[PDB]
PDB file of C-alpha atoms in Angstrom:
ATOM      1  CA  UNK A 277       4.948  -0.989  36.831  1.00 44.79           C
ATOM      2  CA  UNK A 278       1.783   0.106  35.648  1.00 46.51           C
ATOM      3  CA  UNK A 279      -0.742  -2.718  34.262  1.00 46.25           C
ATOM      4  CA  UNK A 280      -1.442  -1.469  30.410  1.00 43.95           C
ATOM      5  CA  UNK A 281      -4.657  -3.374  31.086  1.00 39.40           C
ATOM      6  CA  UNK A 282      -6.607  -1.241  33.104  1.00 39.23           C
ATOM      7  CA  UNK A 283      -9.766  -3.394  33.976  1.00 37.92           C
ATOM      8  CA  UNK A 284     -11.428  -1.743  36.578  1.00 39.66           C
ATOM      9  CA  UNK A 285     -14.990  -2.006  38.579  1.00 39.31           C
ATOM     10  CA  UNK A 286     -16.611  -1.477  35.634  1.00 37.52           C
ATOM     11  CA  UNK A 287     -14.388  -3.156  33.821  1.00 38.16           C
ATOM     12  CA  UNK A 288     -13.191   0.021  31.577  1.00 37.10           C
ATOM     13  CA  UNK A 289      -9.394  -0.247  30.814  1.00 39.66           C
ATOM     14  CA  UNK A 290      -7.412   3.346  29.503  1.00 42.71           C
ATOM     15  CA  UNK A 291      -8.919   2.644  25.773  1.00 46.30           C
ATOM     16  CA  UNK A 292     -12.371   2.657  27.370  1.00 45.33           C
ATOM     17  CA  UNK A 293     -11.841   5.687  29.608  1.00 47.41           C
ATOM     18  CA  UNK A 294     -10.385   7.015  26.579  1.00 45.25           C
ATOM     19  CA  UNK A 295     -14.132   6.644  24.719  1.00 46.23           C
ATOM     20  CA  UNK A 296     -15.970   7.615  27.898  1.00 44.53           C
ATOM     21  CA  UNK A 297     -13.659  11.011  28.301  1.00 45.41           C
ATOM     22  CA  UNK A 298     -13.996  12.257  24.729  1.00 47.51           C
ATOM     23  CA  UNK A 299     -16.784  15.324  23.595  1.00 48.34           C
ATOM     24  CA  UNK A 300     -16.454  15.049  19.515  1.00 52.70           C
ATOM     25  CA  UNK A 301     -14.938  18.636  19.875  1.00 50.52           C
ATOM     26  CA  UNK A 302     -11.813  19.177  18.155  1.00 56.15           C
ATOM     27  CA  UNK A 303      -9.144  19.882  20.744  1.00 53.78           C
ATOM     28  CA  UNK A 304     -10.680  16.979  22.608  1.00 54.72           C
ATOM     29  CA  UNK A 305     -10.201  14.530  19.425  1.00 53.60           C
ATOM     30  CA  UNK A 306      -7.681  16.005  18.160  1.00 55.00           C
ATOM     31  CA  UNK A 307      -6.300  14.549  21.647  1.00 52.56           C
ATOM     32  CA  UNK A 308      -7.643  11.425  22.417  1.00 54.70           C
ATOM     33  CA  UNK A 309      -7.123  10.287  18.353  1.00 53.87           C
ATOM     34  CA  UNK A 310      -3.905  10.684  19.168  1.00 54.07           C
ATOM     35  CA  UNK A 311      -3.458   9.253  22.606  1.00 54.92           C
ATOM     36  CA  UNK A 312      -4.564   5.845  21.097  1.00 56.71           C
ATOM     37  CA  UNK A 313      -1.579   5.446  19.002  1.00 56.44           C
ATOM     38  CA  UNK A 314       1.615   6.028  21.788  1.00 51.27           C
ATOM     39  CA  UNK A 315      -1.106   3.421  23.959  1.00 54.70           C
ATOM     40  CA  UNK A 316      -1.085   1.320  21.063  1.00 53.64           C
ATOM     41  CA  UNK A 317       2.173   1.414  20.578  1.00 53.12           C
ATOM     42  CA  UNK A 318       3.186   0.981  23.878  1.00 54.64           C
ATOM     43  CA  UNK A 319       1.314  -2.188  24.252  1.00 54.26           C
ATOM     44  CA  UNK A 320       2.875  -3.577  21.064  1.00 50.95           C
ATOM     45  CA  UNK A 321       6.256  -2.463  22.421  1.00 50.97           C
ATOM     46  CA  UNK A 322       6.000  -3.436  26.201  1.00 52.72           C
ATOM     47  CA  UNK A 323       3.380  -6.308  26.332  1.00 53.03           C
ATOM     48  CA  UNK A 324       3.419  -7.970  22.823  1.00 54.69           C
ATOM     49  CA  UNK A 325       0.918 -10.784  21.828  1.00 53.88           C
ATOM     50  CA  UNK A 326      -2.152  -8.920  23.638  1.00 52.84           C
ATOM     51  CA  UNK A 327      -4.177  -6.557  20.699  1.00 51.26           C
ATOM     52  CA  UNK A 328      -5.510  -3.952  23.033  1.00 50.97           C
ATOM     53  CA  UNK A 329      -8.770  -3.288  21.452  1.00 51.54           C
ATOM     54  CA  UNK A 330     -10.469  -6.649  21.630  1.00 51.65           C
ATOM     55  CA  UNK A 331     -10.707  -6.242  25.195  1.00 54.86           C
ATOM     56  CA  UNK A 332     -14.160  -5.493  27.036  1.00 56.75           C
ATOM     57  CA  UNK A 333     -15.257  -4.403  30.048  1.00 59.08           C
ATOM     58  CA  UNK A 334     -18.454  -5.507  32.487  1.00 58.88           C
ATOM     59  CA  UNK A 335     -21.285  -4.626  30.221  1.00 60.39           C
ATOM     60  CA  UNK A 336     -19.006  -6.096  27.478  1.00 58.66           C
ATOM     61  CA  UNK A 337     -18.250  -3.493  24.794  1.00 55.74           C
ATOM     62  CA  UNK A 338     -15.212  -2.638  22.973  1.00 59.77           C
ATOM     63  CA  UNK A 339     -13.704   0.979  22.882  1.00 55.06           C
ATOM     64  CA  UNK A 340     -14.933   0.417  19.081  1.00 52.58           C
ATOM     65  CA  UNK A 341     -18.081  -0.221  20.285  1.00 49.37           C
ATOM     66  CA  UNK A 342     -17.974   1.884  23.203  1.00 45.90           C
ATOM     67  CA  UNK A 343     -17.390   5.022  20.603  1.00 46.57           C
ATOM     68  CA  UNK A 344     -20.084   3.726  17.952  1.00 48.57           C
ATOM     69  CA  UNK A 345     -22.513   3.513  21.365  1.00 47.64           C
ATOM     70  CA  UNK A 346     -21.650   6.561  23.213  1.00 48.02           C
ATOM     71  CA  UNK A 347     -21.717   8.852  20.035  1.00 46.78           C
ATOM     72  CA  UNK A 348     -18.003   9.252  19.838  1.00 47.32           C
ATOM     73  CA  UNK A 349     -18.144   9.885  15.791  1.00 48.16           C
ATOM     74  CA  UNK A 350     -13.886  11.601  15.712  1.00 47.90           C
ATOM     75  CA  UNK A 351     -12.984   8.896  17.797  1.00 47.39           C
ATOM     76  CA  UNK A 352     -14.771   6.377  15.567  1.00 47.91           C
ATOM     77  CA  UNK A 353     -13.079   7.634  13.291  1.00 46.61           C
ATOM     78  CA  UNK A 354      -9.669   7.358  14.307  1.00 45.45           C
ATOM     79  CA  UNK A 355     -10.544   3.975  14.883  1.00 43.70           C
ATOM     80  CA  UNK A 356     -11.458   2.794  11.943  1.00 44.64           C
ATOM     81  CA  UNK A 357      -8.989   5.116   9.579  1.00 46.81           C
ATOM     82  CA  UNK A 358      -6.361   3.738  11.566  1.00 44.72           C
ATOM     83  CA  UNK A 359      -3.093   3.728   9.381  1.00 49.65           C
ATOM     84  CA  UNK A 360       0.093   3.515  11.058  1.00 49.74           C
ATOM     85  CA  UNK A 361       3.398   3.390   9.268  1.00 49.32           C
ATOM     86  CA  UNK A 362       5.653   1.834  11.166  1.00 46.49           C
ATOM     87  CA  UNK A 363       6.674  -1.923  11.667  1.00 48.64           C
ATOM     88  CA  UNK A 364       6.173  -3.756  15.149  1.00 48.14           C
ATOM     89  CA  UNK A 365       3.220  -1.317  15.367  1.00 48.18           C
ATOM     90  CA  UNK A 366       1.920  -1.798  11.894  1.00 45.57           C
ATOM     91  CA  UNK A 367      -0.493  -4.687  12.384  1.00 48.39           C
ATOM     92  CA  UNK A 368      -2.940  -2.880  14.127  1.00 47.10           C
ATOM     93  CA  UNK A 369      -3.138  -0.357  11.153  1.00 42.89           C
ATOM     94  CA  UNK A 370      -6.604  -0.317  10.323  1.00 40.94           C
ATOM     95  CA  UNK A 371      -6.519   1.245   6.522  1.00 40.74           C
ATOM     96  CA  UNK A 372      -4.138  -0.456   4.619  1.00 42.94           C
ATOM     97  CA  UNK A 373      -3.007  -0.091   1.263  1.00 39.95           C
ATOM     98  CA  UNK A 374      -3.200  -2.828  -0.880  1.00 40.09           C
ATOM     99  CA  UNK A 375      -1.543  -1.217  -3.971  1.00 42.58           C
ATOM    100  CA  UNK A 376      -0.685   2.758  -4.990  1.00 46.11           C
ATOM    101  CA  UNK A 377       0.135   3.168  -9.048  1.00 44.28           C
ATOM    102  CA  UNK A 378       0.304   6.518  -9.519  1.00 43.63           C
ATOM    103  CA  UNK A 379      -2.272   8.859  -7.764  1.00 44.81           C
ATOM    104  CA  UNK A 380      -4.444   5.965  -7.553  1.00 38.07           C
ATOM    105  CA  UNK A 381      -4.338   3.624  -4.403  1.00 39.87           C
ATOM    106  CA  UNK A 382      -6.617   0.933  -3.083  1.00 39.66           C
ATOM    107  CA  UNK A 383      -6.792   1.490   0.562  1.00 39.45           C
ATOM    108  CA  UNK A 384      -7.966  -1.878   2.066  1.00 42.60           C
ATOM    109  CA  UNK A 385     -10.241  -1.357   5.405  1.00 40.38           C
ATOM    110  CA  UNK A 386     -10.505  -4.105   7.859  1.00 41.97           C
ATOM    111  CA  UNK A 387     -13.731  -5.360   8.605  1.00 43.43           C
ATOM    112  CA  UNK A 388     -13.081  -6.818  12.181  1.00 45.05           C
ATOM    113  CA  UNK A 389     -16.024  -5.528  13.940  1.00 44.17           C
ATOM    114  CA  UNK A 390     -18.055  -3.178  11.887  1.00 45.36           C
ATOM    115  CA  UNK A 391     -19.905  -6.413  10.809  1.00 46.00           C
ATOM    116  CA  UNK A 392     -20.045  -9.948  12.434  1.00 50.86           C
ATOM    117  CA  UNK A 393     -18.355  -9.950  15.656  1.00 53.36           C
ATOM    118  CA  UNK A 394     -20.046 -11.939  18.352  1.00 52.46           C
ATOM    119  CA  UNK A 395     -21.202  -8.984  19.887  1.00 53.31           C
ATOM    120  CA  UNK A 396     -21.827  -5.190  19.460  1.00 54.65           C
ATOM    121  CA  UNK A 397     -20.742  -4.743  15.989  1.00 57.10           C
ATOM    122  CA  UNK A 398     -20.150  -1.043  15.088  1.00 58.00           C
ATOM    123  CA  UNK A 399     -23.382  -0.874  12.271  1.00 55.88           C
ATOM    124  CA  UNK A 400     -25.516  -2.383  14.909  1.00 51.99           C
ATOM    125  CA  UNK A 401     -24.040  -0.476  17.589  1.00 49.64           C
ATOM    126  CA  UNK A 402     -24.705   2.247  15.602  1.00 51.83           C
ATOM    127  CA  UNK A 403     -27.980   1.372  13.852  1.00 47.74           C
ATOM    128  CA  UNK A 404     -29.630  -0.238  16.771  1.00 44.99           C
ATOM    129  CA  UNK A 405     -27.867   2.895  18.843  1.00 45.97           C
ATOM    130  CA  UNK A 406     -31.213   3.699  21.546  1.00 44.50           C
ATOM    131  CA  UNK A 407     -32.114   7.517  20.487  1.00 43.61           C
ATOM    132  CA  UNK A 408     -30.102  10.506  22.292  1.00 45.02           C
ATOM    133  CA  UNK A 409     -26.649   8.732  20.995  1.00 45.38           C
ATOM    134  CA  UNK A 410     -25.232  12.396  19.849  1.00 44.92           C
ATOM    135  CA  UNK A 411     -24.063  12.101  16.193  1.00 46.43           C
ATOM    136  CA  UNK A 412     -25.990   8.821  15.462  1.00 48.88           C
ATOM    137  CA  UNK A 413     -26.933   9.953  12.121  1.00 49.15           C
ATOM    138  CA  UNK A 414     -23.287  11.078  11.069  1.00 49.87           C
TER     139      UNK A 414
ATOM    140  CA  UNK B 139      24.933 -18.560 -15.425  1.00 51.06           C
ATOM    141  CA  UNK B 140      27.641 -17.085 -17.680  1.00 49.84           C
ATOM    142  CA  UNK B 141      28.829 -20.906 -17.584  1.00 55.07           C
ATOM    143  CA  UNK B 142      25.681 -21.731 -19.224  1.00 55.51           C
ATOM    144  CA  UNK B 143      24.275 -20.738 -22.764  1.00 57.43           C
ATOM    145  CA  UNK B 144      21.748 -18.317 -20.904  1.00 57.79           C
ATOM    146  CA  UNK B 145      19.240 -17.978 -23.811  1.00 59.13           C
ATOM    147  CA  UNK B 146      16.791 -20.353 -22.677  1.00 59.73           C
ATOM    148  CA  UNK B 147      18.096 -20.928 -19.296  1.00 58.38           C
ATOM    149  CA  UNK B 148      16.332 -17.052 -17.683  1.00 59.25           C
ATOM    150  CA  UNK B 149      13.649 -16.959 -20.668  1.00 55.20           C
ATOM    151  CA  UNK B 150      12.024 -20.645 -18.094  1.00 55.41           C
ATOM    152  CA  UNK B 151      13.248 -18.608 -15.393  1.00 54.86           C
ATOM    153  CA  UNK B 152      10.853 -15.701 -15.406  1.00 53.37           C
ATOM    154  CA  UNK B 153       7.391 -16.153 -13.773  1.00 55.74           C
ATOM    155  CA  UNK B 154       5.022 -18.670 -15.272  1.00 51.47           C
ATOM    156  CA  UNK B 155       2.251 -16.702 -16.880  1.00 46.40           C
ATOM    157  CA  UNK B 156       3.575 -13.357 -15.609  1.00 47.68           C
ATOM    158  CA  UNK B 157       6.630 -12.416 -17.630  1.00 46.81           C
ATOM    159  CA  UNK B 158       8.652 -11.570 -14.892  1.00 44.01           C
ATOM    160  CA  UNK B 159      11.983 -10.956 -15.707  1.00 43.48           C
ATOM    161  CA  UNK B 160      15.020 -10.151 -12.961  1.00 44.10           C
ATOM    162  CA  UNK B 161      14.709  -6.865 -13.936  1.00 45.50           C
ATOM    163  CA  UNK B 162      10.966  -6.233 -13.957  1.00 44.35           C
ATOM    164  CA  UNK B 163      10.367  -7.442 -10.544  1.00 44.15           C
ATOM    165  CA  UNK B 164      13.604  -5.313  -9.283  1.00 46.14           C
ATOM    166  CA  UNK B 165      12.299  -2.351  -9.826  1.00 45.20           C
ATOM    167  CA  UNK B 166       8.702  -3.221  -8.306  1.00 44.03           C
ATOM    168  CA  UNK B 167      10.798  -4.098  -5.244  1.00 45.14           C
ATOM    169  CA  UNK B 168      13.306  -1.785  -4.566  1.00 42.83           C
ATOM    170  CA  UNK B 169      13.623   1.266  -2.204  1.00 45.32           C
ATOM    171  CA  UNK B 170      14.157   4.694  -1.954  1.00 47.26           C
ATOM    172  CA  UNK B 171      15.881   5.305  -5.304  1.00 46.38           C
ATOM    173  CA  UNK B 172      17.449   1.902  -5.596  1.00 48.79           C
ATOM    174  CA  UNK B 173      17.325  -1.600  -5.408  1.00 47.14           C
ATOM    175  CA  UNK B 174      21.438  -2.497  -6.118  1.00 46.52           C
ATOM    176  CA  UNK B 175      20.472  -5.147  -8.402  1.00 43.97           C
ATOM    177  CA  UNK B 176      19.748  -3.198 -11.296  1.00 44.53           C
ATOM    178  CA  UNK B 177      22.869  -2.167 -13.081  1.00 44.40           C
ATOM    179  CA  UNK B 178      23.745  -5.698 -12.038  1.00 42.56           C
ATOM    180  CA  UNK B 179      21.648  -7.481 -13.575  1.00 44.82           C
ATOM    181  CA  UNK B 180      22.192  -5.034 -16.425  1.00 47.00           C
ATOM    182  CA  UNK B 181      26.053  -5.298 -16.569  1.00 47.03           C
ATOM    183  CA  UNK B 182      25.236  -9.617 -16.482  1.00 48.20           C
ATOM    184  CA  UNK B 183      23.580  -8.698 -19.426  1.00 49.54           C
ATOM    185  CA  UNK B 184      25.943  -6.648 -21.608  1.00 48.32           C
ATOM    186  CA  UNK B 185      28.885  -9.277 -20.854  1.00 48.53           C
ATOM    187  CA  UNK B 186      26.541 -12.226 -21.456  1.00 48.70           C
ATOM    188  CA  UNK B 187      24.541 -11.231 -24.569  1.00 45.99           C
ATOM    189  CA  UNK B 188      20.696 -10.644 -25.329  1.00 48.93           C
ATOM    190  CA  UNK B 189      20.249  -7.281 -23.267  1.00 47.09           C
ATOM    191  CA  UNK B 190      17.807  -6.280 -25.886  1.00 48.97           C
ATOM    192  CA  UNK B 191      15.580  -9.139 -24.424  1.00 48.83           C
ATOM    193  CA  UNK B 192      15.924  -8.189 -21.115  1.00 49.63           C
ATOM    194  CA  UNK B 193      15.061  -4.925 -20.765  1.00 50.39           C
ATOM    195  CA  UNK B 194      12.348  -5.058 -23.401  1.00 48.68           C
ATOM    196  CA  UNK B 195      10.652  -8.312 -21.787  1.00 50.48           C
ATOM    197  CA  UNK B 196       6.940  -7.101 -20.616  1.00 49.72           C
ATOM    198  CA  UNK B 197       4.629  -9.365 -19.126  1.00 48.89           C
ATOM    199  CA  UNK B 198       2.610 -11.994 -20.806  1.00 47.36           C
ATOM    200  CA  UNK B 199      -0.469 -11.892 -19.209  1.00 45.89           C
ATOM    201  CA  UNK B 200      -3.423  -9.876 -20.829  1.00 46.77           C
ATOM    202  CA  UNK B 201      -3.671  -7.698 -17.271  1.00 43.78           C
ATOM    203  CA  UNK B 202      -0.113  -6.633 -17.335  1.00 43.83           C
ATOM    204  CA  UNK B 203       0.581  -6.733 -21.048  1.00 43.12           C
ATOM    205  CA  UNK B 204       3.170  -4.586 -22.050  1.00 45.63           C
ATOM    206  CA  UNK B 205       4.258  -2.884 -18.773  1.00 43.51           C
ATOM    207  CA  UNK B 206       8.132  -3.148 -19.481  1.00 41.39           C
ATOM    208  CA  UNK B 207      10.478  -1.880 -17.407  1.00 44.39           C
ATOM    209  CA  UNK B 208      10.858   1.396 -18.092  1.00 46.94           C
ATOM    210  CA  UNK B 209       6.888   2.099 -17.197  1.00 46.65           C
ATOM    211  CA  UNK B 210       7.617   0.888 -13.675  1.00 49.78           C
ATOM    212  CA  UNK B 211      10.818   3.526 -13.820  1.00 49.96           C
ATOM    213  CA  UNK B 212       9.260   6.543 -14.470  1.00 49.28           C
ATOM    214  CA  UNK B 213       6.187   6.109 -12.150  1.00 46.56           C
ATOM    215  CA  UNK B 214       8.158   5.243  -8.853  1.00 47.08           C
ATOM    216  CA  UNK B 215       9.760   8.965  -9.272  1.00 47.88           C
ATOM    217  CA  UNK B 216      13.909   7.486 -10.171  1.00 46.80           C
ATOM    218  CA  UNK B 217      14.627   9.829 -12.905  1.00 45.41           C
ATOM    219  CA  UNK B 218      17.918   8.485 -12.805  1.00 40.50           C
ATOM    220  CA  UNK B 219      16.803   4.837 -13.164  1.00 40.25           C
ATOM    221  CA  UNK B 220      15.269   6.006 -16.525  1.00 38.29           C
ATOM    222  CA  UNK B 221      18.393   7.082 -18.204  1.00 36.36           C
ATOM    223  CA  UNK B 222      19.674   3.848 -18.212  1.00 41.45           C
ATOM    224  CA  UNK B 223      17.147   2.349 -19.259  1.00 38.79           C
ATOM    225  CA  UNK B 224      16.602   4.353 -22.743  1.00 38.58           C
ATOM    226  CA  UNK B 225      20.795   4.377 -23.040  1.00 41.71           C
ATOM    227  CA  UNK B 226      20.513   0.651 -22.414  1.00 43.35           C
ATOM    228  CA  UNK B 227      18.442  -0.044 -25.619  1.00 43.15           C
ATOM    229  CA  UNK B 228      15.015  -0.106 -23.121  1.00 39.68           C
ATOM    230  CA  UNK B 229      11.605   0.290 -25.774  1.00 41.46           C
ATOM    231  CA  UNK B 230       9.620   4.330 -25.607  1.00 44.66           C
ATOM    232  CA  UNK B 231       7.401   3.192 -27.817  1.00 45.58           C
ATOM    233  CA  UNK B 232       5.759   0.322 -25.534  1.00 43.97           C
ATOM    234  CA  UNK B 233       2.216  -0.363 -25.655  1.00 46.79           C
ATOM    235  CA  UNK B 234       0.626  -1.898 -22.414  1.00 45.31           C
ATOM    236  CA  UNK B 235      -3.020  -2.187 -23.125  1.00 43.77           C
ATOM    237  CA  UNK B 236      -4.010  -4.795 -20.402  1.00 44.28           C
ATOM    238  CA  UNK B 237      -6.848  -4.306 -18.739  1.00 45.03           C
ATOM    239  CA  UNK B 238      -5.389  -2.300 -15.647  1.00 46.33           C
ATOM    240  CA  UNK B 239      -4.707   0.114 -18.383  1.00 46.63           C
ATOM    241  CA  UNK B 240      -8.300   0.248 -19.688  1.00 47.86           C
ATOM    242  CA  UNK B 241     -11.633   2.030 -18.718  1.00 45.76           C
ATOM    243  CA  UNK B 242     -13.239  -0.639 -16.319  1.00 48.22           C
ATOM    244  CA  UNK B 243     -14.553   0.038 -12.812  1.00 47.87           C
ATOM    245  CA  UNK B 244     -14.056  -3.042 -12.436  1.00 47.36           C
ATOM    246  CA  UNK B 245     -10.277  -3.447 -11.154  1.00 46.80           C
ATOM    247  CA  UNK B 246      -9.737   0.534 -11.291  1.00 48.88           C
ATOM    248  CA  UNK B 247      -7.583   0.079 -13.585  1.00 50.24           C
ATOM    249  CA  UNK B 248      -5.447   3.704 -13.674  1.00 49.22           C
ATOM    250  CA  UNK B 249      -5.203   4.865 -17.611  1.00 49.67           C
ATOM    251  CA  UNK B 250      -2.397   7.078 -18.481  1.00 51.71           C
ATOM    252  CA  UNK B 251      -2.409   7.047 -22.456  1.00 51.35           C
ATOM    253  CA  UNK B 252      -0.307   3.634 -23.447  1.00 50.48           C
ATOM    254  CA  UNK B 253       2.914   5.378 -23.759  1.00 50.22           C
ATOM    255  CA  UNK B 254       5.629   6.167 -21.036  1.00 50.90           C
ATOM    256  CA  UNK B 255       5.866   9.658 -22.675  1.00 53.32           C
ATOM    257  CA  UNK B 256       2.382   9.804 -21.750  1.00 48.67           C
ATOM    258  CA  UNK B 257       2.992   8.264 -18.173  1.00 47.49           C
ATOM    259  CA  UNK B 258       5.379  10.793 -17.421  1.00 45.82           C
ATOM    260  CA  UNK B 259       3.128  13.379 -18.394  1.00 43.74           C
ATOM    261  CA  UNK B 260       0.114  12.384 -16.022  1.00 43.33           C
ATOM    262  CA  UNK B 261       2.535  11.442 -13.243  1.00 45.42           C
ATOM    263  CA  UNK B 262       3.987  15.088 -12.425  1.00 45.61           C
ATOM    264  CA  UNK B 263       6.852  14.484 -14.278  1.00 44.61           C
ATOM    265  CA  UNK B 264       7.720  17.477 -16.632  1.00 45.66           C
ATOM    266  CA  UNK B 265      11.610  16.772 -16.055  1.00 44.42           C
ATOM    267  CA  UNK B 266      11.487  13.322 -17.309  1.00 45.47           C
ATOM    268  CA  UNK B 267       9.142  14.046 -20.376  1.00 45.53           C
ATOM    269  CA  UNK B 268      11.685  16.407 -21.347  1.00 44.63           C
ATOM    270  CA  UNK B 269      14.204  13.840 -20.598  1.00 46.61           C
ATOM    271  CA  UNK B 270      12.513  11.344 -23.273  1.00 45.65           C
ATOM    272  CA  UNK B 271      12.709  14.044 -26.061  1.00 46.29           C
ATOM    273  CA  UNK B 272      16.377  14.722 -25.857  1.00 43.50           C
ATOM    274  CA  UNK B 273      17.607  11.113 -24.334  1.00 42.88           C
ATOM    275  CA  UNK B 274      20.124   9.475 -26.993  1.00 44.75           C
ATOM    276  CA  UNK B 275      19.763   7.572 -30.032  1.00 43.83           C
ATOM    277  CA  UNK B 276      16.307   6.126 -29.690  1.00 40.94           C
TER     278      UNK B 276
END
């Protein structure tokens, strides 16, 4: 079988070739937004108790971080409006819902690693991004 | 319980500080249409006596005050619930001014107009405020 962790010279598994590949154009996100689920999925259906997107690779940056770095803005996006509805897949939701009344709903972000992580958080990935980082501003 | 005297015995029951009833927290809890418990707990209460209480008990608290059972009925969509609510001598003319039901940006609360007929109305639910006009006796 394939190895969901897909460490490689540079230490980039599929969710970091996954950042690396994308454009920010729309049939490319549209794709790769996607792709990150079924992978996500996958690895909390075939190899439980391992969160895929903590992992790093050599120069040590998340495929959060590797999106807020390299400009990926769709992807970041994905990322961090993360919502799936499903159980045994549902803990890596990133935008939960903490209550829903009527029209009203208090959707409940997770702050893992846009602020204090021990490295390469996505506001200071993003703030202290270098200068050609496409869509740094957005 | 229909052993017991009753009349005391589910009046400790019900949440400390909450005024959660059997029936209140059913309908919070249920699913798609239905929780299975709800004419139950309603047919304990027409062989056992003090219904009235039951299905007019809203919460204590001054953040929930007044939410009674049929509030929670209209807004999660069961016009079917409703009816027997109303035919089971269930209060229209319930007042929940908490503070979830005021104007406060803090705790967005969501204010609909302190009357289900009102909660009905800002809900998109023109079947069930026509339902409250002609429902029976009350």
């Amino acid at each position: 079988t394939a190895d969901i962790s897909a460490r490689d010279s540079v230490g980039n598994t599929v969710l970091h070739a996954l950042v690396e590949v994308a454009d920010n154009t729309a049939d490319n996100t549209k794709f790769v937004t996607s792709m990150y689920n079924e992978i996500l999925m996958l690895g909390a259906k075939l190899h439980p108790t391992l969160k895929l997107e903590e992992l790093t690779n050599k120069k040590g940056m998340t495929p959060l971080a590797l999106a807020a770095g390299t400009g990926k803005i769709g992807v970041l996006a994905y990322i961090l409006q993360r919502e799936i509805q499903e159980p045994e897949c549902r803990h890596l939701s990133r935008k939960f819902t903490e209550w829903a009344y009527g029209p009203v709903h208090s959707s409940l972000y997770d702050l893992s690693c846009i602020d204090t992580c021990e490295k390469n958080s996505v506001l200071e990935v993003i703030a202290y991004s270098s200068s050609e980082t496409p869509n740094r501003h957005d | 319980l229909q052993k017991s005297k009753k009349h005391l015995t589910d009046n400790e029951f019900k949440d400390p500080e909450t005024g959660k009833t059997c029936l209140l927290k059913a309908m919070l809890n249920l699913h798609d249409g239905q929780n299975t418990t709800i004419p139950l707990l309603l047919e304990i209460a027409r062989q056992t006596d003090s219904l009235k209480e039951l299905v007019n008990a809203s919460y204590t608290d001054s953040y929930y005050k007044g939410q009674t059972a049929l509030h929670i009925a209209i807004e999660r969509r069961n016009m079917a619930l409703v009816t027997l609510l109303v035919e089971n001598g269930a209060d229209v003319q319930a007042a929940a001014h908490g503070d979830f039901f005021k104007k406060t940006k803090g705790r967005p609360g969501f204010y609909f107009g302190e009357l289900p007929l009102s909660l009905a109305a800002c809900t998109n639910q023109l079947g069930i405020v026509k339902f409250l006009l002609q429902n029976s006796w009350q």
